[PDB]
Design a protein around this ligand. Structure first.
Ligand code: A1BGB
Ligand code: A1BGB
Ligand code: A1BGB
Ligand code: A1BGB
Ligand code: A1BGB
Lengths: 79, 79, 79, 79, 79, 85, 85, 85, 85, 85
């Protein structure tokens, strides 16, 4: 018996109005806003990596070892 | 017996109005907004990687090792 | 016996109005908005990768190792 | 028997209005806002990594060793 | 029997209005705001790593040893 | 006078506008004007008497949602001698 | 005067507009004007009497959703002598 | 006079605008104007009497949501001799 | 006079604007104007009597949400002799 | 006079603006104007009598949320002889 990340709700009544609710959020990206106004961007790239935009990554994994959620704007030359 | 990421709701009544609800969110990307107004972008690329737009990635995996959710704007020259 | 990512709801009554509901979201991309107004973009590419648009990827996998959800704007020259 | 990250709520009444709710947030990125107005950016890159945009990463993993959530703007040349 | 990071709420009444709620936040990034106005940035990079944008990373892991949540703007040349 | 020109190029765009007026636009947005949501009423034994003589009476469980642009929204109006010249 | 020109190019676009006025546009949007959602009523033993003499009475469980552009929305209106000249 | 020019380039954009006026825009936004949400009422034994003579009465459990642009929103209005010249 | 020029380049942008006026914009925002949220009422044995003669009475459990732009929002108004010239 | 120039470059941007006026903008913001939140009322045995003669009475459990732009918000107004010339 083991509980992990469990939302539990219980209610009891006889007469009237009863409301029961449960919510669970795991690995959730919520509410990302970006505004660019009159922005000047000049990029010169020679064999590299340049990142300018908006990146939103949400990952949920079970029994996963060595997982990478996001890898943005990198140069890898492993031998 | 094992519980993981479980939303549970229970309700009981005799007379009236009863509401029971349960929600679960795993690896969810919600609410991404981007606005660009009068933006100037000049890009010169020679053999590289340039990223300017909007990227939204949501991944849910079970029993997956070494998984990568997002890999944006990279140069890889492994030997 | 094992529960993972399970939404459960139960309700009981005798007289009146009863509502029971359950929702589950796994690997879901929701609500992506992008607006570009009077935007100038000049791109010169020679053998590279340039990404400017909007990308929304949602992936759900079971028993999958090494899976990649999104790989946007990259140059790969592995030997 | 073991409880970890569990939200529990219980309520009881006879007559009236009763509200029961439970919420759980694990590895959640919420409320990221970015505004750039009249911003000038000039980037010259030769074999490197340059990151300018907005990155929001949320990762939840169970039984995962060595996992990396985000790796942004790096140069790796391991031998 | 072991409790860790558990939010518990209980209420009882006979007549009237009763409210019971429980919330849990683990590894949550909330409320990040950034504004740049009339900002001039000139970057020249030769084989290095330069980071200028906004990064928000939230990671929750169970039974994970050696995990790294964020690694931003680094040069690694391990032998 | 508004003049835009582009000469001796490979890719060229020349746009000139005298007067411009933008409008309203909605992208991925939700709106709620005059919305009644989630009303629950429980009554066991209610004794009610109404005696109306030339009036406006609104009685019982009432849920009204209204949205008017160039008009008035009323629930109970007992008036008289309404004229427009 | 508005002039736009493009000469000696390979790909060229020249657009000139004197006066421009944008309009309204909806993209992936939801709207709710005058909406009644989720009304639940439970009554066991209700005794009700109504005596109406020249009036407007709204009685019982009532759910009204209205949307008017160039008119008035009313639920109960007991008026008299309405004239327009 | 507004002049924009671009000569002897490979990629060139020349835009000139005399007068410009931006508008309203919504991107991923939610709006709530005149919204009634989450009303719960429990009554066991209510004795109620109403005697109305030429008036406006609003009685019982009432949930009203209104949104007017160029009009007035009223719940109970007992007036008389309304004229417009 | 407003002049913008760009000559002898590889990538060039030239924009000139005489007069500019920005507008309102919402990005990932929530708004609540005239919102009633979370009202709970419990009554066991209420005895209530109303005697109305040419007036406006608002009675019982009432939840009103209003939003007006160019109009007035009233709940109970007992007036007389309203004229506009 | 406003002049912006850029010559003999590889990447060049030249922007000139005579008069500029920014506007309002919301990014990831929440607003609450005229909001009633979390009202709970419990009554056991209430005896109430109302005698109204040409007046405005607001009675009982009342929750009112109002938002007006170019109008007045009133709850109970017993006036007379309202004229506009
Ligand atoms: C709702 C209600 C109930 C009972 C008592 C009243 C006063 C009201 N309020 C109104 O009628 C508001 N109104 N008035 C006028 C003008 C007018 C009214 C009556 C007769 C002649 C002219 C009007 C004209 C054109 C389109 C809309 C409207 C409008 O909406
Ligand atoms: C709804 C209601 C019930 C009972 C009492 C009243 C006063 C109202 N309110 C209104 O009739 C509002 N109204 N008035 C007028 C003007 C008019 C009304 C009656 C007779 C002659 C002219 C009107 C004209 C054209 C299109 C719409 C409308 C409109 O909508
Ligand atoms: C709601 C209500 C109930 C009972 C008593 C009253 C005074 C009100 N309030 C109003 O009628 C407000 N109003 N008035 C006028 C002008 C007018 C009214 C009546 C007769 C002739 C002209 C009007 C004209 C055109 C479109 C809207 C409206 C409007 O909305
Ligand atoms: C709400 C209410 C109830 C009972 C008593 C009163 C005074 C009010 N208040 C108002 O009617 C406010 N008002 N007045 C006028 C002007 C006008 C009113 C009546 C007759 C002729 C002209 C008006 C005109 C056009 C569109 C809106 C309106 C408006 O909204
Ligand atoms: C709310 C209320 C209840 C009972 C008593 C009163 C005085 C008020 N207050 C107001 O009516 C405020 N008001 N007045 C006027 C002007 C006017 C009013 C009546 C008749 C003729 C002209 C008005 C005109 C146009 C649009 C809005 C309005 C407005 O909102």
């Amino acid at each position: 018996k083991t509980k992990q990340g469990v939302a539990e709700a219980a209610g009891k009544t006889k007469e009237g109005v009863l409301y029961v609710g449960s919510k669970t959020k795991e690995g959730v990206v919520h509410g990302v806003a970006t505004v660019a106004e009159k922005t000047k961007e000049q990029v010169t790239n020679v064999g590299g990596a340049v990142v300018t935009g908006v990146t939103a990554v949400a990952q949920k994994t079970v029994e996963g070892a060595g997982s990478i959620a996001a890898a943005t704007g990198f140069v890898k030359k492993d031998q």
